[PDB]
Design goal:
Three copies of one chain form a homotrimer.
Chain A: H1 2-13, H2 15-40, H3 42-67, H4 69-111, H5 115-133, H6 143-162, H7 164-187, H8 189-192, H9 200-222, H10 225-240, H11 244-253, H12 274-286, H13 291-299, H14 303-324, H15 335-339, H16 349-391, H17 399-406, H18 408-413, H19 418-433, H20 436-452, H21 467-476, H22 483-496, H23 501-529
Helix pairs in contact in A: 2-3, 5-23, 6-7, 6-14, 6-23, 7-9, 7-13, 7-14, 9-13, 9-16, 10-11, 11-12, 11-14, 12-14, 12-23, 14-21, 14-23, 17-19, 19-20, 19-21, 21-23, 22-23
The structure holds N-hydroxy-5'-O-(2-methylpropanoyl)cytidine (3 copies).
One N-hydroxy-5'-O-(2-methylpropanoyl)cytidine binds next to helix 9, helix 13 and helix 16 of chain C.
Chain lengths: 533, 533, 533
């Protein structure tokens, strides 16, 4: 007993020192492994060295910003005062310079490019103007968020699309994600057998969802997802000027689904303003989760375009939310509270994986059931429309025919050519009435037909569309904005914050419209920047 | 801002006028389409014209009955008083006339028909007498509901079965329903692949359930299901004399399942009397839902017989409930409250479809699990019974052998011939211990063997049975009365009305017996009316 | 009415007499059937006669012990006092005799057996010593439970393994269970089609779980499971000296899973001590359910070893729980309350089957989801470890390689030979990080390779291992102790007794370690008793 007591006392004495010592030993062992690998053959060992270097750089940066924050603020203070003193005369100069730059760039580049892209820019203008017309509080609007959002979208798009180094990186990331979920496809062979490929959607696509949920929960427990979310949220906050919680939500949505995103700010959901709740719902509707990314890349959709669309959507979502529905009341929630996100209550990584996996049981079931019902309804609608058409001697009438004409103007404004606008309109109709999955499937079919080659027109029917139309379509459909999505979103938001039910419902409706408009804006920018093949 | 305010004021001014104007414009466009179709080719366009005419007639009738209700009641009042004044002497005359008519019809028709059907009528008498013997409150019974229920069953059966125009209509309706769920079968190919037919029950039959649930929810939101329920309920109410809620429930059950039917009167479930709760449960047990109709018609079961059985069951269910368990306490619920049914709380048709689809997730899982367990138990029972029989030198002993002899008297009383009564008894045993699905499958096998042709007896074993036996079997098995059904029914009823738990449990037991007896009565009438092949 | 009243009065008069009369008539009919079968052909009829005889014997024994308990206690009292008076000097004599017997048996048998088994005994000693070192309350420990637990394990193992009559019985029982769940496999063909074998795990293995749950619920309603649990619990109670509830739990766990076992003492869970809760969790972790037994026997695992391991585990679980974590507080719960187990609230056998089946819906879903996620994670881990290894010119690095070396000492102490210890270590790693299902699958592969024959080493890689190693592996892996299991166990225990949350969590962690150690002890004993092939 005495020896055990002495050992316990020794353990109590060295607690912090012992933990630091063991962590340091582990890190030193990792560094030794890295250096041995570099010694033997540097060319193979390069990735590990790069990862270690970037991690060290980020840790050093974080520590310095923490400790030296006051000194940096002191250094920055004089310049802010000097800018404020001269701001009155300088604001006009800055605005004029920006306008002149816009004019020069637009003329030279896009005029050397063609008409369709000039039309894309016109569509950008039209969408923004319309949102300003039908805003909830048109008189009181802050234009800095809108302008900065559009500018940031343009800069990101320009870098990623018109530069070779930028283009290669996203391709690499897409390949990584695709392989990462391919690891999932193999793991599900055990449960459903080697004949799981017989039923593709049920035994490949949904298991991908399951694996993604588990991985995300583990990373949440470790504390990485949070880091990336905080960085991007701080960027948006320091530039767009939005409130804290909405920026945090938007950054999270980039790689998180609509249902799980509000849980980031769950504790403060009761106290949020109506505008911030609208922003949350709009961000949820305007961006897709990471789970669907691997599947969509597998279909044939470009990885670079999908990732760029997801990244660009969040700033656009916030900008459109502010313009469509601006804030009229003071925000209670503080920056420190919002940025802080409570970690999982579980006790070990494996418990977090288990809990994350169990939650997915509901989502998959609801998805499968809704798909069954809505596709059956589409079949009934097509058969009945054909029956009605036969009366007027047009037996070819179908859902696709009405939705081609109804949605054509939106496609034309986005910069798609006249011939392909109808084909894009069919996909938009599929996205709005049904999930983006069906629409992406149809798009993949058109892409595959283009790649195989053959007659553009088998008969007076066009078979495949041009590459640029496909890129614009990729941007236009990268959202969770559906009518069934509206219901589940409302239900979840009401669950988390029972007090705010009616505010949640009212936000939902306008939010979905804002999300679709935000999705259109990214497509307009992509059309402006992508060259005609 | 001023222009927006002026537009909002103009919108506020014209609200009702604008809505009426747009609805009128839409209706006029529909009528123009109809008339154009009729102009070009009337023969093709006939269905649309017929639908429009009947819809207009019903709307006019409803409006007139609403506005002119007082005047019609005033016109009707004198005749009621005149009848009441002379009722004392006239009641004996009416009863004698009815008895004489019954005797004459029975003699001529059924005597020219044969012995089996006279036995069917005898079975009708026997079942009613037995229910009167074992009633909860034998002394206090109202005979008008019982007699009127039997009479209405007889009239409906006579019209539908012995008249050619009546026979054709139900065949047409069955074909419509079969095609309607065939639309479902196609829609489920997407999720489970084109090899979904490999697993027939899992990937065809259950998806049919899903599609039916979605369609029913949409129609509920639109407000059609409610209209039909109200019409049939009013008929039963004005003739049978039952209380409001039970009539409403019975009309709904005709095409609604046992689990969803009480939700029609959910708000008033706490306050219902014991007799009305027994009536609800009996109606639930005695009738089948619309989802199973398409499958059962697909197996080979006749559409006309299935639909006629479902329609006839509800009046029989109410009559048997009253005779078996009569009311001893005053009914609180009013007609207006009961007939009114709150519409779905959802916000658009698509939300209603989503919500209806999500609910079906539980039902399908429970069905599949119960089927797995109970069929495995049947296998074990057969193997053990064979093992026991081998001891006594009868290795052929099985579940079917015991259940052939045990249930034979019921089949004989229904009018089935002696040879086929055993075969029907096996099916009845399957229905009672297991769901009607298995029993209908066996019945379909026997029907198919009859249609193929061949030896009636391969050896001293009969292979197929006569057509009339199949019709009587179709009527006898059209119910949800099983022991597993008893449990889920009790659970759901207890959930909706927690206060009434014990009353719910006591009602359940007697209710199932009443339901089975009601199912037998329809078969007796069918045997009386169907001719010997 | 009067006749009904007279009949009701007559029924009231004869209630108990009538029930006894009918039960007696049924029993007499059963006996007549037995005697007729014996008359015709005794050889065939033997099983029924044996069952009847044993049932009669047990009923007579129970009745006599009930009625004559006081007289038997009176007879036993004098001997207890005489033993107590002389106990002071006699305890040393008894202990010395036991030690001498242990020495003689060990020397003769195991010395004539070989080194490996002497090492097995050494491993037994080592595990017990280590548990004594790291006990929660080392100073206060009661050694009688530990010693008696080890002794009872040894006696059961000796009888079952070294005697031919004992060996045959468990083989027979395993065949019975395997056929019993094979009945399940047939029943599931209806739902998933005859092509259900295409997806083996989803449509065979999980349906086995469903059928087992249903059968267990039915037997619980009838009252058999309870009888067996009570008998074994009384044995453990009268010998080990443990408290009532923990003994009852341990006996139940032998054939009940970790999740359902605490429901036996659900009403008293709030008031249990910390030590008893630790014992409950340890028993849950150290034993497997009956559902998995049929599957594991199907893989190729020996029936006799599996059943013996399950039986031996519970006494070991209690002993290890006491030594690892001893009780420091008085036990409130009484023997009578604990032994009594409330029967199911349902109303008939079929309701109990339905309720038992519905509960299984959650378990199967969670199992499938966790398997998908964890196997995908294993794939990712193997690929990344191979990538890291390629840097150091060892592309063969994998999960199995690390886990072979890490767990080798445990396998060596259990008595496995040096060459096969690594192979066993891989299986132990699979069991700890993933469910025992995967590990048993790998073990079945090794057994099948041994049976087929061929090169022991294809190259410097061993392909199959010796029979004794397989037996020790069978004992070592017969547990539910996994990390995912830890989470669900904690969740369920917290649900049943919300007051005890923190005590539940603290018990869980130590409990899992205790369970694994208990699993090792049974393997050590098996190695001591099994001869070298
Ligand atoms: C998931 C794929 C295979 C699919 O075909 O289903 C699409 C529907 O699934 C919703 N969805 C998706 C992911 C998520 N979190 O990762 N939460 C959601 O709600 C989403 O809105 C859409 O409607
Ligand atoms: C549904 C078919 C494919 C089947 O084989 O299953 C039969 C069992 O399903 C119950 N059932 C059915 C429909 C319903 N609402 O539409 N509610 C229910 O409870 C019903 O009682 C019976 O036992
Ligand atoms: C069941 C087989 C096919 C399987 O591969 O799954 C293994 C996992 O299932 C857990 N399990 C099992 C039975 C039970 N009651 O009978 N309760 C449980 O928790 C158990 O712990 C293990 O982890």
């Amino acid at each position: 007993e005495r020896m055990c007591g002495r050992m316990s006392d020794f353990c109590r004495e060295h607690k912090t020192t012992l933990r630091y010592i063991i962590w340091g030993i582990l890190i030193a062992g990792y560094l030794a492994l890295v250096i041995a690998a570099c010694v033997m053959n540097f060319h193979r060992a390069l990735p590990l060295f790069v990862i270690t270097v970037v991690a060290i750089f980020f840790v050093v940066w974080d520590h310095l910003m923490a400790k030296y924050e006051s000194q940096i603020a002191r250094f920055l203070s004089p310049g802010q005062r000097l800018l404020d003193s001269h701001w009155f005369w300088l604001k006009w100069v800055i605005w004029g310079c920006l306008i002149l730059g816009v004019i020069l760039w637009l003329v030279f580049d896009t005029a050397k490019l063609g008409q369709q892209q000039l039309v894309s820019f016109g569509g950008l203008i039209i969408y923004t103007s319309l949102t300003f017309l039908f805003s909830k509080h048109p008189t009181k609007v802050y234009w800095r968020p809108v302008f900065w959002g559009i500018g940031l979208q343009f800069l990101l798009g320009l870098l990623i699309l018109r530069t070779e180094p930028g283009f290669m990186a996203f391709d690499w990331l897409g390949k990584q994600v695709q392989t990462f979920l391919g690891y999932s496809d193999a793991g599900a062979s055990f449960v459903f057998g080697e004949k799981y490929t017989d039923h593709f959607f049920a035994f490949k696509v949904l298991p991908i969802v399951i694996f993604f949920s588990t991985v995300m929960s583990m990373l949440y427990y470790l504390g990485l997802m949070q880091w990336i979310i905080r960085k991007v949220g701080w960027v948006m906050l320091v530039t767009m000027g939005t409130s804290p919680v909405e920026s945090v939500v938007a950054s999270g949505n980039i790689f998180i689904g609509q249902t799980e995103s509000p849980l980031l700010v769950r504790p403060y959901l009761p106290y949020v303003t109506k505008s911030e709740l609208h922003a949350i719902m709009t961000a949820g509707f305007s961006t897709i989760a990471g789970s669907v990314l691997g599947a969509y890349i597998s279909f044939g959709v470009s990885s670079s375009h999908l990732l760029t669309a997801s990244v660009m959507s969040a700033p656009a979502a916030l900008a459109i939310s502010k313009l469509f529905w601006p804030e009229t009341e003071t925000p209670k929630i503080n920056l420190k509270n919002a940025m802080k996100m409570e970690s999982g209550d579980s006790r070990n990584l494996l418990e977090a994986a288990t809990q994350g996996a169990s939650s997915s049981i509901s989502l998959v079931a609801n998805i499968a059931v809704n798909l069954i019902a809505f596709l059956a309804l589409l079949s009934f609608m097509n058969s009945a429309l054909s029956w009605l058409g036969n009366m007027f001697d047009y037996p070819q009438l179908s859902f696709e025919v009405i939705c081609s004409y109804v949605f054509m103007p939106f496609a034309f404004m986005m910069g798609v050519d006249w011939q392909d606008s109808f084909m894009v309109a069919k996909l938009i109709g599929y996205k709005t009435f049904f999930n983006e999955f069906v629409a992406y499937q149809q798009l993949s079919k058109l892409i595959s037909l283009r790649q195989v080659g053959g007659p553009k027109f088998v008969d007076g029917v066009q078979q495949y569309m041009s590459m640029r139309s496909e890129a614009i379509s990729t941007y236009a459909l990268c959202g969770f904005a559906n009518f069934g999505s509206l219901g589940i979103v409302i239900g979840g938001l009401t669950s988390m914050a029972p007090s705010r039910k009616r505010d949640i419902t009212a936000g939902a409706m306008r939010a979905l419209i804002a999300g679709t408009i935000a999705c259109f804006l990214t497509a307009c920018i992509a059309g402006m920047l992508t060259n005609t093949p």
